[PDB]
């Protein structure tokens, strides 16, 4: 073995497993999913003594995995390198948890103003907090000012970025928050109707949206005087948003 030295001895044999996913979604304005996938990786922080042989186990509520690529140490069993390393990458498409639903509403008002209401519905256990929430609502190019009021969170109209940005610190599962805007328009060539960009989101949810759960990670060292019951094991789930757009 050239990835793990011999004679590693740890006093406290601990085990840290980060499962990291980016859920991606393109959704029509009416609620229809137009594309979605999860890209995941499982990184393992190992502090185990000797040259241990591990079996990593999960629900292959189960999951489809459409593709895998493993660390060279795999054969799911492997002798892990010391310290931090990436055990596998994966991608799933079926039965993804879509942690937010974005619900856009746009009312034209003459050729002068744009009345806009956007609703976030959060769709996961209410015992869990989504974090770092941002909702980007694109404003047309010919906007003189925009007025917004928001209940949860704070919202500023970055006019340079040409988009209202709505930021929200926490939000629990099975809830809903909303934001309302009035967009004052300049006059413009009525030749070109406006190419309405989608609404973008970013969030961090404490769960794998692929529904991945770790069943077992078992450690077996035969030579050294410890066993699986001796290893302190820990697992965190972290779902970021990649491209999370609701059309119109």
């Amino acid at each position: 073995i050239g990835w793990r030295r011999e004679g590693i001895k740890y006093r406290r044999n601990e085990l840290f497993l980060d499962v990291l996913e980016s859920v991606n979604l393109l959704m029509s304005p009416q609620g229809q999913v137009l594309s979605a996938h999860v890209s995941g990786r499982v990184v393992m922080k190992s502090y185990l003594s000797g040259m241990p042989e591990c079996k990593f186990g999960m629900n292959d509520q189960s999951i489809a995995i459409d593709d895998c690529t493993f660390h060279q140490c795999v054969r799911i069993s492997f002798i892990p390198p010391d310290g931090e390393f990436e055990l596998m990458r994966y991608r799933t498409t079926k039965d993804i948890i879509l942690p937010f639903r974005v619900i856009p509403l746009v009312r034209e008002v003459g050729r002068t103003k744009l009345e806009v209401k956007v609703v976030i519905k959060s769709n996961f256990k209410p015992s869990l907090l989504a974090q770092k929430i941002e909702v980007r609502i694109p404003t047309p190019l010919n906007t003189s000012g925009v007025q917004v009021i928001c209940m949860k969170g704070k919202a500023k109209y970055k006019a340079s970025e040409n988009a209202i940005v709505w930021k929200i610190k926490r939000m629990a599962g099975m809830k809903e928050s909303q934001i309302s805007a009035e967009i004052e328009l300049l006059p413009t060539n009525d030749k070109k109707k406006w190419a309405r960009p989608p609404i973008s989101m970013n969030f961090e949810v404490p769960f794998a949206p692929s529904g991945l759960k770790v069943r077992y990670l078992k450690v077996f060292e035969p030579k050294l005087n410890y066993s699986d019951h001796d290893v302190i094991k820990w697992v965190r789930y972290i779902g970021r948003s990649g491209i999370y757009e609701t059309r119109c």
Binding site: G57, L217, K233, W234, V235, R236
Partner: peptide, 9 residues
């Protein structure tokens, strides 16, 4: 953060 891992086996 990290939460404990109870054996499901």
């Amino acid at each position: 953060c990290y939460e404990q891992l109870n054996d499901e086996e």
